[PDB]
Structures are given as C-alpha cells and as structure tokens.
Design a protein around this ligand. Structure first.
Ligand SMILES: Cc1ncc(COP(=O)(O)O)c(CN)c1O
Ligand SMILES: Cc1ncc(COP(=O)(O)O)c(CN)c1O
Lengths: 396, 396
C-alpha cells in the first residue's frame, strides 16, 4: 500500500530547472545545466550523428534484440578508445565490454555485479563528486565513503589529503576515480599524480573503478585516457564505466559501456557472464539506437573525421569561455583571482561562490547556479558573458 | 578480485540460439525464439515505425535528456491504451507513467520501488511463467513464491488449484498477473475468472502487478486489456509493467512503461517521486528513440491506422499458424488432440512434448524448441509446417 510513502527529496539540480523555467525576467542565465550548449545556447544533435541516423534509417532491416552486451562493434570501438589501439589488454583479450543505457547504467550494473559476485562493501567516492554516485552504489547495497580531494583554499587537488584519506581503505575496497574533467571541480590529477596513484593502488589492493563520462573534453581523446591507461598497465583488474552522452551529444539515447578487465581471457569471461546475468535481471538487453550511431560513426573514418572535429570544436568553445570568463570578470572589476578557472578542465568548476552568494545571484539577478557554486561553463555565450560577470561582481 | 568467480548458468533459451546457429542441416526450424517472424521467417521493422523514424530524423533538434519518467505524450498514450480513453483513473489523475527500457526494465524499477518503499517481501509468480521474472524480483531482494496455474493433463488453466494456492499469500504480498497471452502457456483467464480474481484480490489485500507485454496479440487492443481493467476498477492501487517490444516490433530499442495507480492524485505523486528516485539510481533517464517512435505513431491517427493494421496482421498470422498447425499434425497422422493449441493466445504454447521428445527433436531432426515443450508459433511458416509436423509426429 502507498499512503504512508515518503516523498522523494528535491534533486539538487532539478529544482533549478523549474525555478529557471519560471523566472519571468528573460535576461536570466542558467548555469546549473550539465549539458553542453553552443554559442546560441542550443544543444544541437551533431551532424555526424544525424548522418549516422539517416544511414541507419536506410539500412536497418530488423529491430530484433541485441545480445545482453549489445552491439560488438560498439564494444571493440569503446575499448580501443579507452585503452589505445595496440593495448595489450585488447590483444590478450582480457577486457570485455557491455553496452549500457548511459554511463549511469554502466555504474549501476558494475555496482550490482560487484555487490553480488564479490565481497566489496565500501566504495570510495571523491569529495566532492557527482551526487548520483552515492545513490547508485547505495541502491546496490554498497556503502560509500569519501576521500579528500578539493583544496577549497587554493582551488586545487589536495593530493596530500587525498592519498592520506585513501589509507583508510582496505584491500578489497573499490576506489572510484574520474577519468578526466572531474565533476564538479574540473580538477584532474597530473600524469605524475595518476602514476603515484596507480602505484599506490597496486600496493594497497584497491579495485579501481573509472567513471569516464567526458573523454575528449579536457585535452583530446587520447590525452584524456592517459590516466586510466596508467592504471590499466599496472593492474590485473579494473572496471571502467564510460558515457557517450556528452561527447557525441547523445544524452537521451542512453549510451555508455561497462568494461571489465581481468588477469586473463579465461577469468574475464567467467566474471563477465555474471555481469551479463546482472543486466538480464535489470533491463535484459541494451537500447540499440544511440549505440548503433556511435558504432557506425567510429567505424566509418569519413564520419569519424567529422565527429572528431565536432568534438574539438566543443572542447575549444568551452576553453574559450573559461578564458573569456576570467578576464570579463577582471573588466567588471573585483578583488579576485579567478585564473584557477583557466587551469580546470571540462564543462564545470566551482566558482568559489558561497551558497549565500549563489542565492542572491538567482534572486536578485536571474543567474542560476547550483548551491555548491558549481557553474557550467558551456552555458556562457560571448553574448551573456557581460551581464553574467556584472552580477557575479556585484555579489562579491 | 574476480578469479574465484562462479560462471553464470546457461540461459534456458540462449543455449538454443547457438545450437541452432550451428546445426549444419539447413532444413532446421527454430521454435524457441520468442520474437515474431513473418511468413518469410524475418522479423521486419514495421512500416509505421520506419515512417515514424524518418519523421523524427527530419524533426529532432536536440538529444538533450528526457525527464526521469520520459516523454509525457508517451505516458498518456500508454495509460489510455491500458485503461481506456474515458477511464476514471485517468480523469481523477490517479495513475502515473514512467517510460522505461523495455517491459523488463519496468519490472525491475517496480521491484526496486516496492523493495525500498514498502514492506512487500514475497511476489507470487505463476507456474509456469517467463523465467526472467524470478531473477528480476530476486535481484531487488524480493522472494518469489508460485501459485498453481497449468493443468498439464487437460492443457488448461487450473482455476481451482490457482485460487487455492493464492490463499497461501498474505495481505501485502504482490501477486504477478499476465495481462493477456500468458507466457509460456498462452492460457489466459476468461473475463469471469478475471472478475472473481479481482474480487478475491480485494478481499485478501494483494497488490496486483500486471505484466502486459503482448497487448494486441490475443483478441485486439481493447479486448486484451479487459482483464486488467476489471482489476483497476476494483482496486485503489496496482502497478502495471507494459512492453512495446512485440506489438510495435521495437525489441532492441527497449520501450516499455511502469504505471503506478493509487487512491488519489496526491498519493500517486508521492509514491511516484520515489519510483523516479529508483530510476535515477538505475539508469537516470530513459532511451528516447523507441519511445519517441511509439509516441508519434499513437498520436498521428494516419500513422496509428497503419500500425493497428500491422498489428492485426501479426495477430492473424499467429492465429492462422495455430490453426494450420493443428490440422497439418492431423494429416501427418498421430494419436492426438492438439486442438488445445487453437484455444491458446499469443505466440506461445506448451506443445505437450516431453524433454526427451524435444531432445530427439533437435538431435534427430533439427527442430529446435525449449525444454519445457514451449513452441513459438510465429516460427512456423506455411512452408515449414510440413517437415515440422512430420518430425513431431515421428517422435510421439
Ligand atoms: C561524472 C559523471 N559520471 C557519470 C555520469 C553519467 O551520465 P550518463 O548517464 O548521462 O552517461 C555523469 C552525468 N553527467 C557524470 O557527470
Ligand atoms: C511475459 C513477459 N514479460 C515481460 C517481458 C519483457 O520484454 P521486454 O523487455 O523485451 O519488453 C517478456 C519478454 N518477452 C515477456 O515474455
């Protein structure tokens, strides 16, 4: 019976959506989005994907079910993108990929797999990290502990505090790492920090779990993977949850992949059969559309050439706004040092605004942002940069 | 670590797939499919859906995320199809629909919702029923008990045994019902049995859970819903998991819906917020494609006219094969009475063959079928009907 059922809380970011689409003062800027927007403030469907879709519309002959792990071409394409084209992990066949409904679905299936087939109990999530991370692991029954990460003072990665908090984790604990473009800080470890982390991860016996939802948004496709590749060359086992939502603009088609890595082909096949069991009990088989689109794009090099360009254009727009944000702030005039913004990668960063400030921002100006002071840089156009910086400067 | 991980068992139906796509004697007939096939043994993508897809390809401007509950038009369209166009449940706004990845995803989200927000512990599944049913509820942590159903002697619905086993269930237990086209028997209650069941369900306090994956395959769209509608007019609460996989031929796009019914708009909104919380922790938001296709078809009456015809054609083909199966068997000559086949609805039925027989069927003839003697009627074409009936007759 449902009458004494507790109403679910307001999702941190969803409340904003509604308040924004209510604010009758149209000079309003929504910075708590999470999705990429072009200079027009529009989230378009990539040309490569549209071409890909016409191709599928012309060539599909059936809608019959995919296998639990999805379209195979999609699988090999994802692990090549992740580990590199000549990666030993691929050659020795010690990796297996299951196509899943978005990066979140990949995280849930990993969670269920881990919860039913191993003795992992705790999962270490960075502080801060994407909020849905806790809920995902919690629903699988795993407990979430947090390691330090953000130096609120210097707006940086507090490595010392970081390694110092991980020492609290036992061998057997799963440690969640953001591949690149840390959500919500945009601070990523340098390659040397990744390596010390890889080294320490082996000595302490953690099971690395990479959340890779922004490949291509920090430096490039290969560059962004260098961190995970540092771990994958040092570990016998690891799990990587990747999303194609942002980098292919396929948000609503739900396309991601959960990749398993084990010591050998024999062991990976045995563990993968159970991961497939977890999928069958969840949604049975994955949604073919978004994945078909990614599979055909990445495999037709004419189409892959166009996509790559569309992604570097996306990446560069974001980098121009982080850059243009810093100095438009220095023109509107305020005691500051927002240059830390330029050092950060991806669509996000903590502006360093107090919840009090972010509040008067929404209230007195119509500039919307998430309470944590997290701001989506892709929500800034060269046009709305001025009023944005004026408002920000007027609340400091 | 994964080295001591147990290999998952062989899925009952998947083993067949491989053995079939190996049998070097091409006179082979695979009857353990589960998907619909036309007279050519092909699972085509409906014309209505192809038209729908060209329309979407022409009109989509973004791939931005859908809400946790999916496309709203899709939602109202599903509840209208389920409850009727003037249903009080719709007018009083006591139903809420979440678009989900297939009917299986709808069952898992219901499972999670029920497992976290209520005190339901056991779920009553018919014996027999679709095998993935147990795994779905089990993964949510619910226990599955079974009520009688199939009269193996008279190939019928043993109502007496049925109601007699349900008396074992406490008020508060969830009782799983197949809307129409019972999988794997094809035996559905008559409208009078549904009503006694609705009546008894209220007196005992069960929470009905309808698995509605074959709407339109037994008698028609409305006719097939009359059972659930008998329950929905008598209950204050119920949950219905529906799939568009079969009836729209959208198998791999993963399109289904989990509908919640409560006493009033206030309570349904409060419980639904938690169902949405369960979705967010699972896959975040649903796959837009297959659902967009269903939403546009069902709402453009030119397109809906074409789809309906495609569905009645599918339904009628199946009915012609159940009919032509019965007498082709009576021409090949055998002591029998397979007329029970004609009484059954949908793509399935238990032929009544022993596992020993179904075995020599695969082995000595290349006729594949699931161990339970379940046979997918849509796998029979007017062409392969002869050798099929010869083989069957040669093992009786
Ligand atoms: C860091 C991070 N991880 C995982 C996800 C998963 O996204 P999706 O389901 O849309 O791929 C997101 C959502 N943006 C994310 O920001
Ligand atoms: C009775 C029944 N219930 C639920 C499902 C769910 O199917 P899907 O995920 O493909 O909608 C099926 C699979 N055919 C089924 O046969």
């Amino acid at each position: 019976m449902f009458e004494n059922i507790t109403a679910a809380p307001a999702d941190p970011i969803l409340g904003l959506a509604d308040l924004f689409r209510a604010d009758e003062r149209p000079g309003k800027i929504n910075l708590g989005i999470g999705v990429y927007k072009d200079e027009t403030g529009k989230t378009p469907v990539l040309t490569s994907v549209k071409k890909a879709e016409q191709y599928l519309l012309e060539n599909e002959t059936t809608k019959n079910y995919l296998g639990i792990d999805g379209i195979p071409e999609f699988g090999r394409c994802t692990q090549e993108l992740l580990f590199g084209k000549g990666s030993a992990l691929i050659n020795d066949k010690r990796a297996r990929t299951a196509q899943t409904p978005g990066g979140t679905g990949a995280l849930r299936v990993a969670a269920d797999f881990l919860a039913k087939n191993t003795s992992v109990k705790r999962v270490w999530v960075s502080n801060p990290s994407w909020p849905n991370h806790k809920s995902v692991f919690n629903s699988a029954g795993l407990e979430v502990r947090e390691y330090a990460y953000y130096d609120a003072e210097n707006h940086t990665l507090d490595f010392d505090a970081l390694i110092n908090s991980l020492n609290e984790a036992q061998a057997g604990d799963v440690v969640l790492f953001h591949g690149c473009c840390h959500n919500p800080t945009g601070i990523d470890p340098t390659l040397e920090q990744w390596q010390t982390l890889a080294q320490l991860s082996v000595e302490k016996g953690w099971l690395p779990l990479f959340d890779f939802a922004y490949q291509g948004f920090a430096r490039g496709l290969e560059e962004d993977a260098e961190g995970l590749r540092a771990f994958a060359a040092m570990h016998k086992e690891l799990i990587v949850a990747s999303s194609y939502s942002k980098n292919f603009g396929l948000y609503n088609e739900r396309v991601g992949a959960c990749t398993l890595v084990a010591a050998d082909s024999e062991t990976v096949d045995r563990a993968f059969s159970q991961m497939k069991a977890a999928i069958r009990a969840n949604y049975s088989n994955p949604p073919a559309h978004g994945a078909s689109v990614v599979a055909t794009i990445l495999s037709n090099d004419a189409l892959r050439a166009i996509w790559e360009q569309e992604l570097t254009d996306m990446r560069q727009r974001i980098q121009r706004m982080r850059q243009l944000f810093v100095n438009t702030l220095q023109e509107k005039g305020a005691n500051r040092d927002f240059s830390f913004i330029i050092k950060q990668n991806g669509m996000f960063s903590f502006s360093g605004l107090t919840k009090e400030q972010v509040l008067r921002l929404r209230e007195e100006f119509g500039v919307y942002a998430v309470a944590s002071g997290r701001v989506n840089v892709a929500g800034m156009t060269p046009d709305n940069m001025a009023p944005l910086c004026e408002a920000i400067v007027a609340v400091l």
